[PDB]
Structure formats: structure tokens, C-alpha cells
Ligand binder design. Structure first.
Ligand code: HEM
Ligand code: HEM
Ligand code: HEM
Ligand code: HEM
Ligand SMILES: C[C@@H](c1c[nH]c2ccccc12)[C@H](N)C(=O)O
Ligand SMILES: C[C@@H](c1c[nH]c2ccccc12)[C@H](N)C(=O)O
Ligand SMILES: C[C@@H](c1c[nH]c2ccccc12)[C@H](N)C(=O)O
Ligand SMILES: C[C@@H](c1c[nH]c2ccccc12)[C@H](N)C(=O)O
Ligand SMILES: [C-]#N
Ligand SMILES: [C-]#N
Ligand SMILES: [C-]#N
Ligand SMILES: [C-]#N
Lengths: 260, 255, 258, 260
């Protein structure tokens, strides 16, 4: 009934949509397609690709936030098994954001980006991303819910870390092994998000410069050094602290090795 | 000031704040896009949002596939082969996003959740009405046509274009022919990726509605149709002629 | 002191040097693995090495899949549900590596190269003799049996375990039934990934030997039509999971003639 | 035939191989499987998974090396289209190494790693990886071959970057656009290898510690994890990232003019 592409003479090349189908109705799809910059307003043929990769990312992150909320509810009621599924789903959605920014790295021409950017508004930065800002916000109540669940069960993090190793002989329970799977899914999620940050950094080096082996400024006026420093901020620093803790407590090698 | 996507959640740290009027949000029409999500007050199942978001991600990727394919037609019609290559490769990357979106359902959507949601869904609520799918199928013919006519204007045979992908092939080469070969190769990758989508979507359906063939009446879609019709449409390519040319090469070159 | 895979190479910067006796190399048995590559003096096509390596990578992932599935049997037999989960998830990740490796051929192996190489390959050189695939098919029943037995020892129904994946489900739950539910979900992900390998391998064959069904048939190096490949391609590792999926569709769906 | 696990007494669980089929003959598969540490010698059940992920990686890297040599040959003879394919193939092979290291991040138990690492030889390090040492060594001749091909065509790197943009109106030839496609493929390859380095770093943070947000552990060679992080930012083709930054300075019209 409608077309995103009205002035296209060739009718086989029209993007026909908004047919009022029940599939369309269920998804609020016409509403979501209405957010695309209208073809009559695009300033560069690469503009649509630019916008779509961000919208895909923001949809993935709002869903991450939704499932992390659910995981807080599960942990607060000691429903460990149900918490695991929320974290695994979140990791998968995170991996879509990684794919989406790597689309820019692999296919966004830097010269198109620079042309487009010379005309963008002044403080147009992903520091204002709602997916990113809310993922940072919610990470703290998420860690707290896990930490408190481990406490109620009378375990340490060193315990649940150790029980991932089949050869570890300490006594276990159903609850301790469930909290272990939770920790492992949480670590995979945080690893994925850290991966998003590194791939977005590699993208920036290919579009604006500043590859550290070799500074440019964001539209906010900020050196890329600031982006690069924030790129190593984790969702759950406590988990990475517990990893290093395991190295110090269980490694029996420190300050004894040398080159051969 | 910010708005909340979940404004009846008491704990502010659990609030999804957005619509802050930043230039990032303005340039992307992000607030409008987030407005497509079913309101939290109206969800009937906690997995409904996940359901919706995997579709919306897929449809954004497919409308972008369409946009880039139109560009590929424009290039091919003017013999801009290099520039056409990039459009096909970009489409393949977007298609791979759709594959991971539906595999998100395979890996994480509980069949039991799906069946409960499906019992309340409307009748003939089907992806046969997907704009992404229908318009992709629509545009695939003009796309094959633009590639075929560029090959014809070059006076090349498709068999020759296939052959010179092999470094060991000794026949005549030109910049034009090797360019059209890179276009060919990029086109086959795109179609193969789309055939991957169709199969992963089918594997999903097997895990959610049943009917895995290894088991040798079938379940039915929300429009009353057997899953065997889905399985048959699952092997239809975008560019049949490329798969015929591969078959022709085996017969001409196979000893 | 050292070896080279291309020793005659003029430019020393193009030499692939290995076997330097490092501890890294010693721990991994790397020299022996590199020793399996077709020698450069013996290659008959510049794409031969790509062909070989994609298979060797696949076979390494599948023997690891086998090792971890054996561990999953041992866990399930002792009711170590959580530990079994990890084995299945790991096998799934290893399976996804095999998907990547065959899609490398789809995306980058020229059909014309394949045909030239295929014309010179021995008779009945076929992946029906893949040790990875044969031992995977061997172990698939022992693996399903271990899961089924554990479910029975717990006095649960497969339909119950499926229902427990849904947060909205009101039925009785226990720590053991939800654990067995995470195991079911992990073995389904593995089987869907192996079904994914089969479909991508099929798509690759269509682009290299022909026979895309949307369009008598080509033959493998053993003489068999591609019709038998397509049929074997829908065979799952754990048919009883897919059976349980359809069982639930009839059991829970309320619109089968609506 | 023969079994990889002969002391397994249930024959349905034997991994049978060395059947002398032509499939195995062509592939040298029996020799390659013989590199696996024998089951009777493994000291931890996670040891095989550890070894196999390295072996997959080194197979992928030796194939990257082989195809980059071919790319040098193509470039020295101005066969641009042919070189593009070798770089694209290398990129796919690099992506296999990324998935292999991420298999350790997602599934290798830190506690098993530490147990295993406490018994490993001293200075057993991937600094002695042949895939890694040879890829670093060959990257210089690869870049020189591209650079010389660009010079011979009388082009600048700015020109081939600009020609990736459909809106750029400078004069083009078949050669210049072909050399652009080559550049774009080498950038994807180098970005993929930079991705491997970052995912390998994230893995190391989860196994030995040292995640930089928390602020050190030492390698089996006694070297601080800070040196690994420093080398993590070294590209194959630094000149490509230098030309990206060059484009920012030459073509961006915003520097030192924006602010929050
Ligand atoms: C899918 C596309 C993108 C997404 C989702 C995205 C998201 C983000 C996010 C969340 C941040 C804040 C991250 C942090 O500080 O840790 C950010 C910052 C930044 N992004 Fe992106 N980004 C995208 C594409 C781009 C592109 C194409 C460029 C440039 C070519 C770019 C350049 C930057 C810069 C320079 C910053 C730092 C802002 C500052 O410090 O003022 N990004 N982006
Ligand atoms: C991201 C999620 C999904 C997308 C993008 C999607 C898209 C599509 C498309 C494009 C078709 C038509 C394809 C063809 O006919 O060749 C289709 C059909 C179909 N899909 Fe989906 N789908 C999705 C999820 C699902 C789910 C979760 C189910 C069931 C649990 C499902 C079941 C079906 C069925 C049964 C058909 C056949 C329709 C008929 O023949 O009446 N799909 N879908
Ligand atoms: C990474 C590369 C490959 C791997 C790991 C692999 C593995 C396998 C396996 C396990 C089978 C038995 C599965 C079944 O028949 O259901 C098989 C069969 C088959 N493969 Fe492959 N394969 C690869 C590449 C190829 C290539 C490049 C071709 C031809 C272009 C090919 C053509 C066939 C055919 C025709 C069959 C049918 C069985 C027969 O040969 O009679 N495969 N492959
Ligand atoms: C697939 C598995 C792995 C591969 C292919 C691999 C490869 C490499 C390579 C190529 C290097 C040298 C790169 C550089 O330093 O710039 C390296 C260094 C290093 N790797 Fe790995 N690695 C793997 C797994 C691991 C694991 C499991 C650990 C520890 C838990 C580890 C810890 C380190 C450390 C500490 C270094 C720095 C060595 C030193 O500076 O002495 N790696 N690895
Ligand atoms: C290029 C620009 C930008 C990058 N992605 C954006 C999305 C919407 C609006 C602006 C942007 C980026 N933030 C920069 O500062 O360079
Ligand atoms: C599950 C159902 C459906 C699947 N995806 C949808 C999206 C919007 C509306 C309905 C659906 C699918 N079409 C079916 O026939 O089963
Ligand atoms: C091409 C050929 C073959 C495919 N993969 C192989 C590995 C080793 C030896 C031979 C092969 C394949 N089995 C065929 O029958 O066509
Ligand atoms: C754990 C260890 C190691 C990591 N990967 C290896 C492969 C072979 C031999 C040793 C290793 C690593 N090099 C370290 O220094 O911690
Ligand atoms: C992003 N900016
Ligand atoms: C989809 N239906
Ligand atoms: C495979 N053969
Ligand atoms: C790594 N060694």
C-alpha cells in the first residue's frame, strides 16, 4: 500500500511496505521502517548504511538491558538456572552489535565517512547512546544481584571459579555449580562487550586515524586517547579482579621464570 | 530531560532512559525507532520483546540489502564493475546479520514460550508478508538482469568468467573480465548467504513447530499451510542462472 | 637451526621457518602437525593447500567434539548435569568452527580450481570416510542414551523439561529438572549447529559440482548422485529431540486447523 | 584400522581412524591426527581442548602465509584482481583464528589453565609461534609489493582511498579502482589480525588477570602482561593506518573547532 521509494520509475525496484498485514501489525514494523532517513533527504549514498548499523546496534542493546533486568529478578530469587539463560541471550545479542560495527569497518568508505562527518552536528557522539548509557547503568545492579546471590549461598568467587574445572576436588552442591554457570555466562557477556569496544576502536582507527602503533578529535572535540582509555572499562570489574585473584593464589610460578 | 522506556519500574538504576534530544539521537531518528517496541505495559509474555527485536533487526538489514542492491544495478548498468562489487559484498554482510538474528531464536527462544505466544497470535501472521523478504525477491530479477547484460556488452561467456577465478586458468583475461568475475563471485556469496538464512530459519522451525524430516501429517503455519511448503521455498535461489552455470561447468569440464 | 616449508625460496623473508625446538612448539607437537601439509615440491595446484587445510581444521574440531562428548557421557551417567552442559556448549563452539571452515571453501575456492583438482584425485576419495563424521555418527546414540537415561532416573518427562525453559511456565520445578533442561537446550544447540554444517556443505557442493534443487545429477568421486548427499543432510544427531519438539507442538498448540 | 583411545573398552566410543581411505590419504590426515597428545599421556582432561585450539590456529596462519606469498606474486606482476582474492581468503582464515582463541575465552576453565600452567615448561610462549613469527616477517614484503604497485600506476594512497566513495569525482581507471579494492582487502585483513590480538588479550585477562580497568602477572617467560598489551596494537601494515589518519588531516574540516 506504501513505498519507501516512490520516485523510483522502475516498479520492480520499489520497496513496497505498509500493507497492513498481521505480520506487519504484530511487529510495529511500519513504525520502525519510518525511522529511516527519507530517500529524498539523504546527503550521501552511504548515509543509509551508516544509520542502519546504529539502529541495529541500539535494538540489540535495548534487548540486552531487558534481559539483564530479568536476570536481576532471577538472581534475587535464587533462580540460578533461569538467570543463566538471560546472560547467554544477552551475549548473543551483544555479538550482533559486534557484527554490526564490523560492517562499518569492512564496508564503510573512510572518504564517505569524512565527507558525511564534515556536515554532522557538533556534539554528535555515542557517549549519548541510550543503549550504551543504560547498559553501563544496569551493570551495577546486575553485579550486585550476583554478588548477593553468591553470599546467600555461602560461597566465594574463588569457589565458583574452581568448580568449572572437572579436576577440582572441593565439595560442590547443585547451587554452587549453578552459580558457577552463571559466572561463566556473565564473563562471556563482559568479554563480548569488551570485544565490541575493541572492534569499535579498530573501526575508529580506520576512519579517523590514531592507530597506536603509529591526535584526531571526536565531534565532541575530545582526543581519541579518551575513547581508547574508556575502551578497557568492563561491565563487571569484580569478575576480572577475581580472575587475577586466582592467578596470585593458585599460580605457583610468579617471579621464577625467564627466557630460554 | 530524559524519558523512561519502563517508567513504572521503581528502581531508577533499572530504568532505560532515552529520548534526551542529543545530536547522536537526532541524526539517527533513534527515538522514533525505539518507539516501535511494544510498550512494556502491553507485553503478554516476557519473551515477546526478544521475539520482536530479532525481527526488527532482520528487517532493517534486509531493507539495507535492498538499498545496496539498487545501487548495484545502477553501477552495473554503467559498467562500474568495481563499485558494484562493494555493494554485493555489503549486502552479504547484512545478510549474515539476518542469519545471526534468526539463530538467536534457535539458540535462546524457548519452544514452550513460542507456542504460548503463538496460540494468541493472529491468523495468517506470516513472514510471507515481510517487506524485506518480498522486496528482496522482487529486486533479485532486475539484479540478475543488470549483471547478465553487463556480461553481454562485454562479449564474454559466463563460463569464461567463472574459469578465470582460478589462477591456473590460462585463457584470455582483461580488466573488464576479471572485474566481472569479482562481481560474479560476490553475487554467489550473497545468494549462498541468503540460502543459509533460509536453511537456518527452517532448522529453527523444526525446533519450534516440529516436522524435522529425519522423522519422516505435518504441523501448520499460522495461515494453515504445511511446513513442507516452507521446505520447498527454502531452496529457491536469488540468482538461479549462477547455479545453472556452476552445473554447466561441471558437465563441460568434468572428465 | 630450523626447517622451512618452502626451502628453495630466494627471498629469505618469504620463508616459512618452523621446528625451532621451542617449548611452545614442543608442548603442541606443532612440527608433527605441520609435517602433514602437502609438500610444496609436490603440490599440483596453487589452491591445493587451501583445500587441504580447511579439511584438517575441520577434522581437528570434530575429534575434539568427540572427546568432549565422551566426557559428557561420563558426566551424565554420574548425574553431573552442570558439568555435562559445559561439554555440549564447547562441542557447539567447535562445531561452529567446522561451519566456518567449509564456508571458506564456498566463499573462496574457485569452482574451476576444484574441478581441475577433482579430475586428478583418486577414485572414491569421499568424506563418507571422514573419521570425524564417522565417529560422530557412532557416538551420537551413546550420547543420546546417556541423556535419556539420566532423564528417566530423575522421573521426569521430556515434555516437562521442555516446558521448564519458559519463565512463564507454572509447573513444578527442581534443581535437577532445570539442570536437565539446560542440558537439553545445549544438545539442541549442538545438533542445530551440525545440521547447519550439513546445509552449508550442501550449498558449497551446489556451487562446485552443481545440482541446486531450485533448477542426470553430478557424481561424487565414488560415483554417487548428489541426491544421496541431500538426503543424508537432514539426519540429526539426536532425532528424539526433534521428535520431542513436534510432540510439544501437538501437545501445546491450539490452532492446528484454524 | 586403529583407535585414538584404545584403552576405551566400549567400542562405540572408540575414535577409529587410519583406515587408509583415499580421503585420508589425500589429506595426510593420519599424520595430522598423530600430532594429538596421546590419551595415555594427558595430565588434565582440558589439555586436548587447549592443544587443538592452538593447532587449528597454526594451520590457519600457515595458510595465511601461503596466500600472502601468492599476493606478493600477483602484485609484482600488476595482477590486481588476483591479489584481491588472496587477501580476502587470508581474512577468512584470520577469522578462523579469532573464533579459535575465543573458544578458550568462552570455555577454557581458568582453574584448569592454572593447574596446567603450573606444570608447563619455562618460557613456553606464543612469541615462538611460527604462524606468528612468519606472518610478522612476511608482512613487510607484502606491504612493499602493494606500495610499489601503487607507485607504478602513478597513484597516491589518498587517491585509492578516495575512490572507494561513490561520491568522489576524481578521475578513475580500471587499475586505480582495482588497487582500491586491494587496499580495502588488506585493511580488512589487518583489522582482523588486530581483532585476534585483542581477543587474545581479553582471553589472557580472564585466565591470568591484569584487566586494565582494575588499575602485574607474568608470562611463562617471566614477562609482565604489560608487554603483551603493548605489542597488541602493532599492525601488519602500519602505512595503511597512517594513510587513514592522513585523510583525516587532509580532508576533515572540523579539527580544533568542536566542543561539548
Ligand atoms: C555502529 C556504529 C557505532 C556505534 C553503535 C557507536 C557507539 C559508540 C559509543 C557507545 C560510544 C561511547 C563509547 C565509550 O566512550 O566507551 C562511541 C564513541 C565514539 N565513537 Fe562511535 N559508534 C559507532 C560508529 C562510529 C563511527 C563510524 C565513528 C567515526 C568514524 C565513531 C567514532 C567515535 C568516537 C570518536 C567516539 C568517542 C566520542 C568522544 O570521546 O567524544 N563511532 N560510539
Ligand atoms: C527473526 C525471525 C523470523 C524471520 C525474519 C522470519 C521470516 C520469514 C520469511 C521471510 C518467511 C517466508 C520465507 C519463504 O516462504 O521462503 C517465513 C515463513 C515462515 N516462518 Fe518465519 N521468520 C522468523 C521467525 C519464525 C519463527 C519463530 C517461526 C515459528 C516458530 C517461524 C515460522 C515460519 C513459518 C511456519 C513460515 C511459513 C509460512 C507459510 O508458509 O504460511 N518463523 N518467515
Ligand atoms: C572442508 C571441506 C570438506 C569437508 C570437511 C567435507 C566433509 C564431508 C563429509 C563428512 C561427507 C559425508 C557426509 C554425507 O555424505 O552426509 C561429505 C560428503 C560429500 N562431499 Fe564433502 N567435505 C568437504 C569438502 C567438499 C568439497 C570441496 C566437495 C566437492 C566440491 C565435496 C563433495 C562431497 C560430496 C559429493 C559428498 C557426497 C558423498 C560422496 O562423496 O559419495 N565436499 N563431505
Ligand atoms: C589458541 C590459543 C593461543 C594462541 C594461538 C596464542 C598465540 C600467542 C602469540 C602468537 C603470542 C605472541 C603475540 C604477542 O605477544 O604479540 C602469544 C603471547 C602470549 N600468550 Fe598466547 N596464545 C594462545 C593462548 C594463550 C593462553 C591460554 C594463555 C594464558 C592463559 C596465553 C598467554 C600469553 C602470554 C602471557 C603471552 C605473552 C608472552 C610473553 O610476553 O612472554 N596465550 N600467544
Ligand atoms: C562520526 C561521528 C558519529 C559517529 N556515529 C554517529 C552516529 C550519529 C551521529 C554522529 C555519529 C562520531 N561520533 C565522531 O565524533 O567522529
Ligand atoms: C510463529 C509465527 C510468527 C512467526 N513470526 C512472526 C512475526 C509476526 C507475527 C507472527 C509471527 C509464524 N508465522 C507461524 O506461522 O507459525
Ligand atoms: C572433491 C572430492 C574430495 C572432496 N574433499 C576431499 C578430500 C580428500 C580427498 C578428496 C576429496 C569430493 N569427495 C567428491 O567426491 O567430489
Ligand atoms: C599458558 C602458557 C601457554 C599458553 N599457550 C601455550 C602453548 C604451548 C605452551 C605453552 C602455552 C602461556 N604462554 C603463558 O605464558 O602463560
Ligand atoms: C559513535 N559515535
Ligand atoms: C515468520 N513468520
Ligand atoms: C568431502 N568429501
Ligand atoms: C601463548 N603462549
Amino acid at each position: 500500500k506504501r513505498s519507501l521509494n516512490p520516485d523510483e520509475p522502475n516498479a520492480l525496484l520499489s520497496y513496497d511496505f505498509d500493507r497492513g498485514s498481521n505480520y506487519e501489525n504484530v511487529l510495529h514494523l511500519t513504525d520502525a521502517l519510518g525511522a529511516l532517513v527519507p530517500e529524498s533527504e539523504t546527503e550521501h549514498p552511504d548515509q543509509r548504511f551508516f544509520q542502519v548499523t546504529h539502529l541495529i546496534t541500539e535494538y540489540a542493546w535495548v534487548q540486552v538491558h531487558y534481559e539483564l533486568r530479568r536476570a536481576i529478578g532471577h538472581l534475587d530469587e535464587d533462580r540460578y538456572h533461569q538467570a543463566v539463560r538471560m546472560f547467554d541471550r544477552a551475549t548473543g545479542l551483544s555479538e550482533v552489535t559486534v557484527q554490526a560495527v564490523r560492517l562499518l569497518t569492512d564496508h564503510l568508505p573512510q572518504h564517505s565517512l569524512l565527507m558525511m562527518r564534515n556536515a554532522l552536528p557538533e556534539d554528535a557522539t555515542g557517549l549519548d547512546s541510550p543503549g550504551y548509557r543504560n547498559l553501563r547503568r544496569v551493570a551495577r545492579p546486575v553485579w550486585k544481584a550476583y554478588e548477593q546471590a553468591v553470599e546467600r549461598a555461602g560461597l566465594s568467587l574463588q569457589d565458583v571459579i574452581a568448580q568449572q574445572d572437572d579436576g577440582y576436588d572441593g565439595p560442590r552442591s547443585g547451587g554452587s555449580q549453578s552459580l558457577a554457570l552463571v559466572r561463566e555466562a556473565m564473563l562471556r557477556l563482559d568479554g563480548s562487550v569488551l570485544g565490541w569496544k575493541q572492534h569499535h576502536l579498530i573501526m575508529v582507527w580506520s576512519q579517523l586515524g590514531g592507530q597506536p602503533g603509529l591526535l584526531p578529535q571526536s565531534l565532541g572535540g575530545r582526543s581519541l586517547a579518551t575513547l581508547e582509555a574508556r575502551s578497557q572499562l568492563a561491565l563487571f570489574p569484580e569478575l576480572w579482579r577475581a580472575a587475577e585473584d586466582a592467578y596470585w593464589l593458585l599460580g605457583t610460578r610468579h617471579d621464577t621464570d625467564a627466557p630460554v
